[PDB]
Amino acid sequence: NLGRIQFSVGYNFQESTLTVKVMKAQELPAKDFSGTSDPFVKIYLLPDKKHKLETKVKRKNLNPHWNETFLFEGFPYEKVVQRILYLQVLDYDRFSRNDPIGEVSIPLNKVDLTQMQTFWKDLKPSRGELLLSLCYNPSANSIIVNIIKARNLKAMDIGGTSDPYVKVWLMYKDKRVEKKKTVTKKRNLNPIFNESFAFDIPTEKLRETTIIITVMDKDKLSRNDVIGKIYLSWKSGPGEVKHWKDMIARPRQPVAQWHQLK
Numbered sequence: 001n002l003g004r005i006q007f008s009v010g011y012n013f014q015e016s017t018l019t020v021k022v023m024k025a026q027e028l029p030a031k032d033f034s035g036t037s038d039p040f041v042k043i044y045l046l047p048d049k050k051h052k053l054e055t056k057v058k059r060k061n062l063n064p065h066w067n068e069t070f071l072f073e074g075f076p077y078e079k080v081v082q083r084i085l086y087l088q089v090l091d092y093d094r095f096s097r098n099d100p101i102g103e104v105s106i107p108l109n110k111v112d113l114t115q116m117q118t119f120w121k122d123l124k125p126s127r128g129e130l131l132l133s134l135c136y137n138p139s140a141n142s143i144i145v146n147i148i149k150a151r152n153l154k155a156m157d158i159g160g161t162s163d164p165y166v167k168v169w170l171m172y173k174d175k176r177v178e179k180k181k182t183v184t185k186k187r188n189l190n191p192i193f194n195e196s197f198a199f200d201i202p203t204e205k206l207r208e209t210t211i212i213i214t215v216m217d218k219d220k221l222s223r224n225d226v227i228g229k230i231y232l233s234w235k236s237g238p239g240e241v242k243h244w245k246d247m248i249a250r251p252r253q254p255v256a257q258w259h260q261l262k
């Protein structure tokens with residue numbers, strides 16, 4: 001489906017070091033128009049999502065050979081077995097977001113880390129995207145959210161379409177502060193909204209502000225279905241935090257960005 005990746009993993013008691021070698025992959029799909037991809041690998045010892053390692057990029061190669069060794073030193077064995085070795089394979093794109101190919105994860109407590117061993121693991125894996133802009137104006141203590149359009153929305157009516165509308169919630173800490181909502185576009189999975197929403201946000205509340213954008217399918221005569229959500233704050237997904245950072249970092253300048261619905 002998405003290819004498979006070869007790697008080995010082993011622990012050394014004398015050195016208290018976990019070793020992880022990302023050897024190669026095979027049959028990775030194509031993510032560039034050239035019919036090829038530029039695969040590289042991110043490596044995590046979950047739940048630690050902060051410290052990541054990467055392989056080099058192999059330009060235009062659907063069967064890359066990395067053969068790169070990654071070390072995690074000073075780890076007691078009782079701590080290693082608590083972690084989940086997470087590998088994410090992505091296609092590198094020079095002028096756009098890197099295209100994720102696939103991922104694999106294995107709990108180390110199931111592994112005989114005493115001896116180095118090799119694993120072949122098949123790479124494993126959408127509600128739609130929403131294009132929106134944020135603009136923070138500190139002198140006016142405002143954030144303007146523009147709900148512009150969405151594409152490839154999930155069909156939530158059994159007939160094969162949805163009736164999307166987008167609601168925008170302003171949050172402070174854990175409390176709901178204000179609600180906004182767009183009009184409903186019926187029978188549209190790629191709706192254009194071009195609606196603007198302005199929220200008053202004092203400087204003191206900026207750090208603890210969260211904007212929750214929920215794309216809904218208006219099912220009349222029934223509980224409306226949720227197509228997906230977006231969380232915009234300092235503690236959200238990478239792309240979400242990135243947009244939130246660009247907004248705050250470039251005050252008064254609108255910043256638009258696509259966001260996968262979740």
Ligand SMILES: [Ca+2]
Nearest residue numbers: 031032093099
């Ligand atoms: Ca690509």
Ligand SMILES: [Ca+2]
Nearest residue numbers: 032038092093
């Ligand atoms: Ca690429």
Ligand SMILES: [Ca+2]
Nearest residue numbers: 156157219225
């Ligand atoms: Ca529905």
Ligand SMILES: [Ca+2]
Nearest residue numbers: 157163218219
């Ligand atoms: Ca509906």
